[PDB]
Amino acid sequence: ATIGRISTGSKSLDKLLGGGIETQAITEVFGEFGSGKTQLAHTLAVMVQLPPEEGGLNGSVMWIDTENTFRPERIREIAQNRGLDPDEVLKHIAYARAFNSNHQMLLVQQAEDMIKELLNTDRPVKLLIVDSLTSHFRSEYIGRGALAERQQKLAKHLADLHRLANLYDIAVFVTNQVSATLRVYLRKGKGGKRIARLIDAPHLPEGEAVFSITEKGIED
Ligand SMILES: Oc1cccc2ccccc12
């Protein structure tokens, strides 16, 4: 199927990304605390539910949360400020807490069931979020005696995510802290604005986009 794109809410950021985040791809967003990466995740979980003319893909969402950063009230706020029904928007985000790295990998394997169920419906899964990709791996695999297994497991986890993205035409969006993925780095700009820098994209030029965080989530 043709690659679909989900608007981030920011015209500047969308332009940097070639139109928005892509289905059949893993977009990996890095940032320190308060960078805006989780705000971006929340915004995407709303935007994807819009029709294409409004920057979405008429899709449902699946969200894997590793350190309790999902905020249903923030979803409701973004939904309402963008004219959507906050209750309907929340209903179409399937939520799962991942308690550890094994569980996180299991949840990705098990997500395929719901993806299959929704595939030929009015609201197929179009966005799968993992926030954060690495918190559990960093917590569990300490030192150099553990690095090899950590990388192996992470590599397998990324492969599972790539497969879901490609097979079912889903945009996978993961957060991280410092191919295979499209890497975007967030930092604080001036006056409370945030800056995104695209790095090492095979077919998009590097560049930067400045954006804001509002009651609409993110926008220019
Ligand atoms: O495997 C999953 C991943 C993300 C969300 C889920 C929600 C319900 C059941 C399973 C889920």
From Swiss-Prot:
GO terms for molecular function: ATP binding; ATP hydrolysis activity; ATP-dependent DNA damage sensor activity; damaged DNA binding. It comes from Pyrococcus furiosus (strain ATCC 43587 / DSM 3638 / JCM 8422 / Vc1). This is DNA repair and recombination protein RadA. It comes from the Archaea. Keywords: ATP-binding, DNA damage, DNA recombination, DNA-binding, Nucleotide-binding. GO terms for biological process: DNA recombination; DNA repair. Involved in DNA repair and in homologous recombination. Binds and assemble on single-stranded DNA to form a nucleoprotein filament. Hydrolyzes ATP in a ssDNA-dependent manner and promotes DNA strand exchange between homologous DNA molecules. ATP binds at G31, E32, F33, G34, S35, G36, K37, T38. Belongs to the eukaryotic RecA-like protein family. Signal peptide: none annotated.
